[PDB]
């Protein structure tokens, strides 16, 4: 599923990301935009043999288990397939654990490069929330 900007902002708000651990809602919408272009089925195979899954491109080496990545740690204790649903529940649950580490949203390279330091709230403006 490919979410609309406002559609995802509303969904993420319902999934408690309006002010989760110091991060405003715009951060999450902006991150999804540059990580997966709002596509829940997005996947990207990495050099180390790991794969990034879903709307928030969660990595198979540290967060989810896809059974095909070497030093997998499965920090989110969840199968990577669960992160490929049109339902963002699993991705949001895992993203919350990820951001609860001291590195915060820096875990998301696209967010770090295209969102951090920008007017992220612009990503939720012009939306019915």
């Amino acid at each position: 599923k490919v979410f609309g900007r406002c559609e995802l902002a509303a969904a993420m708000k319902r999934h408690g990301l309006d002010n989760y651990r110091g991060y405003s809602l715009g951060n999450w919408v902006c991150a999804a935009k540059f990580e997966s272009n709002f596509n829940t089925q997005a996947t990207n195979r990495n050099t180390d043999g790991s794969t990034d899954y879903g709307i928030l491109q969660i990595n198979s080496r540290w967060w989810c288990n896809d059974g095909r990545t070497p030093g997998s740690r499965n920090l989110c204790n969840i199968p990577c397939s669960a992160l490929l649903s049109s339902d963002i529940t699993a991705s949001v649950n895992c993203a919350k654990k990820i951001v609860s580490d001291g590195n915060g949203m820096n875990a998301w390279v696209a967010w770090r490069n295209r969102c951090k330091g920008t007017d992220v709230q612009a990503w939720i403006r012009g939306c019915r929330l």
Partner: antibody
């Protein structure tokens, strides 16, 4: 499957450092975030803090920086140190993973002269 | 810190009857509210995560609802094994905090 268990002294003196150990069996401590929670005599629960995969820690400000949570990969254990304890630190201490799915049995530690 | 207030403090019920326990937050926490059960001489057990998400291995009679500042834990047809303490906990902001708890007893 995963199992957690606390160990350490059950009786300590005021002003000393209270130290507890949580032994994890079934999986590596490098595969989760680990926490410490305590229950006071009146059914009052307090989340003490946790250590995440990067080594970063989060401690409850209520503890006034008297707390330290560390890990030992080789022993697959993590620890809790609480400095300068007082009778207000008497409580049942529990270790559990960040998700809250796995908890230790809990251990009562009494602080008294 | 975010303060969680639970009510009633105590609730006596007859097995077979249903009950609802309340937890209100001092500020909006979205869906970041979890429910725990705790019996004497035992560690807490997670019943519901993120306000309404089910947990594998928990009886289906437990359900959670709410968002923002108002949350409820419902038990459809209380069983004897359900008597004990119930606590809500928020994970929206650090430090995580617990409500004062509600004691469920047999009437």
């Amino acid at each position: 499957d995963v199992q957690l268990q606390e160990s350490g002294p059950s009786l300590v003196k005021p002003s000393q450092t209270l130290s507890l150990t949580c032994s994890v069996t079934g999986d590596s401590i490098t595969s989760d975030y680990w926490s410490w929670i305590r229950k006071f005599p009146g059914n009052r629960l307090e989340y003490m803090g946790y250590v995440s995969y990067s080594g970063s820690t989060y401690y409850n400000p209520s503890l006034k920086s008297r707390i330290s949570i560390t890990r030992d990969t080789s022993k697959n254990q993590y620890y809790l140190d609480l400095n300068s304890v007082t009778t207000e630190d008497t409580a049942t201490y529990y270790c559990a993973n960040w998700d809250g799915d796995y908890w230790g049995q809990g251990t009562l530690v009494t602080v008294s002269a | 810190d975010i303060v969680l207030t639970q009510s009633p403090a105590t609730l006596s019920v007859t097995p077979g009857n249903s009950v609802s326990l309340s937890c209100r937050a001092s500020q909006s926490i979205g869906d970041n509210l979890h429910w725990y059960q705790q019996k004497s001489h035992e560690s807490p057990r997670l019943l519901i995560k993120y306000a309404s998400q089910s947990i594998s291995g928990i009886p289906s009679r437990f359900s959670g609802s709410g968002s923002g500042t108002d949350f409820t834990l419902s038990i459809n047809s209380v069983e004897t094994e359900d008597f004990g303490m119930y606590f809500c906990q928020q994970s929206n902001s650090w430090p995580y905090t617990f409500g004062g708890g509600t004691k469920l007893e047999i009437k």
